[PDB]
Amino acid sequence: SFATRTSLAADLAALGLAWGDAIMVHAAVSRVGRLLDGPDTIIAALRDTVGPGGTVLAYADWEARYEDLVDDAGRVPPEWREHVPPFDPQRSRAIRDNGVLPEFLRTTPGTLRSGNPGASLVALGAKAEWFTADHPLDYGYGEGSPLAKLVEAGGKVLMLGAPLDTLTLLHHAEHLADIPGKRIKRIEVPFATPTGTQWRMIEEFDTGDPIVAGLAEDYFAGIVTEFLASGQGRQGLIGAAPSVLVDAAAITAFGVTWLEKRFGT
Amino acid sequence: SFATRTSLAADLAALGLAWGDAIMVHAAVSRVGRLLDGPDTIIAALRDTVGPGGTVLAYADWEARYEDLVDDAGRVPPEWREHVPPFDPQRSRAIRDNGVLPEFLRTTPGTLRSGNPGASLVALGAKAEWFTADHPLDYGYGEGSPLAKLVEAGGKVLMLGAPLDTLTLLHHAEHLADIPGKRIKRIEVPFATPTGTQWRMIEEFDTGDPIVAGLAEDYFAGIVTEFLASGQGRQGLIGAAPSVLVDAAAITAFGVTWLEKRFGT
Ligand SMILES: NC[C@@H]1O[C@H](O[C@H]2[C@@H](O)[C@H](O[C@@H]3[C@@H](O)[C@H](N)C[C@H](N)[C@H]3O[C@H]3O[C@H](CO)[C@@H](O)[C@H](O)[C@H]3N)O[C@@H]2CO)[C@H](N)[C@@H](O)[C@@H]1O
Numbered sequence: 001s002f003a004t005r006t007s008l009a010a011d012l013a014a015l016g017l018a019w020g021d022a023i024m025v026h027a028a029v030s031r032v033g034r035l036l037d038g039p040d041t042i043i044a045a046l047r048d049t050v051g052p053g054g055t056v057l058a059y060a061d062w063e064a065r066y067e068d069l070v071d072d073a074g075r076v077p078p079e080w081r082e083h084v085p086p087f088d089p090q091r092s093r094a095i096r097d098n099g100v101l102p103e104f105l106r107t108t109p110g111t112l113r114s115g116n117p118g119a120s121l122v123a124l125g126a127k128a129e130w131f132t133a134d135h136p137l138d139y140g141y142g143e144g145s146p147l148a149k150l151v152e153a154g155g156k157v158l159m160l161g162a163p164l165d166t167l168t169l170l171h172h173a174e175h176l177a178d179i180p181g182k183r184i185k186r187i188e189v190p191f192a193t194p195t196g197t198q199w200r201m202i203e204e205f206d207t208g209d210p211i212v213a214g215l216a217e218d219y220f221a222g223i224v225t226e227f228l229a230s231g232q233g234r235q236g237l238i239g240a241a242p243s244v245l246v247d248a249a250a251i252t253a254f255g256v257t258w259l260e261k262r263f264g265t
Numbered sequence: 266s267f268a269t270r271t272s273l274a275a276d277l278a279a280l281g282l283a284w285g286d287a288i289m290v291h292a293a294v295s296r297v298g299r300l301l302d303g304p305d306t307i308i309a310a311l312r313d314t315v316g317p318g319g320t321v322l323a324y325a326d327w328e329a330r331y332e333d334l335v336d337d338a339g340r341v342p343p344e345w346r347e348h349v350p351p352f353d354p355q356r357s358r359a360i361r362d363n364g365v366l367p368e369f370l371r372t373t374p375g376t377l378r379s380g381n382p383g384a385s386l387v388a389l390g391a392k393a394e395w396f397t398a399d400h401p402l403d404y405g406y407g408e409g410s411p412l413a414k415l416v417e418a419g420g421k422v423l424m425l426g427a428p429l430d431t432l433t434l435l436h437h438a439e440h441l442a443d444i445p446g447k448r449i450k451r452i453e454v455p456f457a458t459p460t461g462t463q464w465r466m467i468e469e470f471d472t473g474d475p476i477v478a479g480l481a482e483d484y485f486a487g488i489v490t491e492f493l494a495s496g497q498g499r500q501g502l503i504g505a506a507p508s509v510l511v512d513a514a515a516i517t518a519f520g521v522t523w524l525e526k527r528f529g530t
Pocket residue numbers: 061097098118119165166168207208209217218
């Protein structure tokens with residue numbers, strides 16, 4: 001009745017997760033079933049499967065509800081500046097819009113968190129320092145980003161019962177896609193430094209909506225479904241959760257080509 | 266529209282929380298209102314109000330769902346032993362049955378957590394080491410426990426919009442109450458040691474139900490209401506949350522006397 005650390009690791013191996021993999025996980029912890037240790041069983045099983053040479057990653061983002069108050073150029077009105085909690089990669093909470101597992105991973109001892117607040121990833125394992133180092137603050141879903149390093153390292157992405165449109169890596173595909181009409185987001189962000197709070201503008205392609213017009217809000221799920229329909233990736237149960245496992249470089253290139261075929265030239 | 270770290274600290278001062286206090290908080294974060302930093306705003310405001318000489322505490326307990334499998338003497342059947350995650354005071358999650366604030370406090374850098382799993386408290390501040398040191402593993406709600414040290418240190422308890430029957434300190438009153446028919450709980454618990462997992466039986470008065478028969482499940486709230494009705498404690502809003510602040514020694518002695526008057530001799 002209880003899914004365990006041992007049984008989940010067996011399900012992960014049967015799905016294709018391998019010793020030494022860098023694995024990025026999107027989880028719906030409720031769908032996994034009754035767990036003896038809650039979400040930490042999932043983290044433990046992932047670490048056991050990849051071993052000390054692997055790395056476990058998740059999309060952390062940043063719990064910053066102050067974006068309801070910015071004006072027209074993305075900056076904070078001066079009566080609110082001293083009240084917005086600044087971003088600390090070691091202390092700021094991961095966003096919980098898509099489950100508690102990122103925050104659970106972030107607070108696991110040894111986990112590192114990258115410096116771009118909205119695009120931050122958490123990494124736990126062999127390559128955690130490299131995955132989270134020198135995150136570019138502008139266009140943090142593109143070159144030199146942790147999502148680009150996951151593709152370069154030959155990483156994988158696991159949708160552990162999570163909706164397929166929550167696959168963060170496809171934002172890296174939107175960034176790379178050579179198409180016109182790509183939407184942009186600008187916002188001012190507070191950073192915590194050893195000398196006090198310092199502000200900075202952030203520019204990036206808007207990941208709060210489809211990269212261009214004419215796309216449904218959940219169009220990432222259709223891209224994943226077509227990817228699986230083409231015979232790529234792997235499906236199977238992780239505990240009680242229907243899960244999907246895909247290669248990071250493959251799904252990224254598939255996402256770029258999916259966009260460059262319907263738009264641009 | 267946004268309750269802030271500054272405005273919450275002002276509400277806490279108006280309620281009676283003082284510089285240097287050791288404060289134990291039970292919070293219903295939803296009732297506080299819209300917060301710029303989520304639960305961490307509450308933790309920050311409490312720390313600002315008590316200053317570096319104060320201490321912030323919460324009831325952590327332990328997320329251990331394995332108690333559905335124990336037999337008659339409280340022990341784990343041998344086919345489940347290696348699957349139960351052992352208790353690590355630095356890694357085990359705080360229970361989330363009564364809100365996320367204990368876990369948020371537990372994962373705040375510098376917070377310490379005591380050694381008795383089911384009765385564990387988290388403490389952040391000047392006296393954190395003393396509050397969490399040498400927690401007796403048997404009858405962890407009594408002598409030498411963190412709840413006893415809060416009374417001895419002249420601490421306070423803040424019900425920040427939380428239901429009044431979640432006041433953990435009244436379990437210390439149940440332990441001290443010289444009354445007959447007090448119910449007992451025994452359970453086997455796994456501990457993580459530098460040499461591997463070690464098991465141990467735990468005995469204590471059962472805090473999963475009223476200490477004796479004839480009491481409603483929520484009878485702590487009536488004790489708090491009578492305490493406030495007698496002109497003790499303080500009421501007021503913390504943000505949008507109706508809150509109660511009480512002296513730890515006073516509410517403990519009131520709880521003991523409440524029990525010794527209706528039962529025993
Ligand atoms: N979706 C409509 C847009 O939502 C924007 O706000 C959105 C963003 O703040 C945020 O979008 C995040 C994004 O920040 C983050 N960097 C990437 C992440 N995939 C997005 O996630 C969002 O979109 C996905 C897919 O629909 C959902 O699964 C997720 O729950 C949703 N929050 O979530 C909000 C809800 O979508 C703005 N209100 C405006 O541009 C517009 O209303």
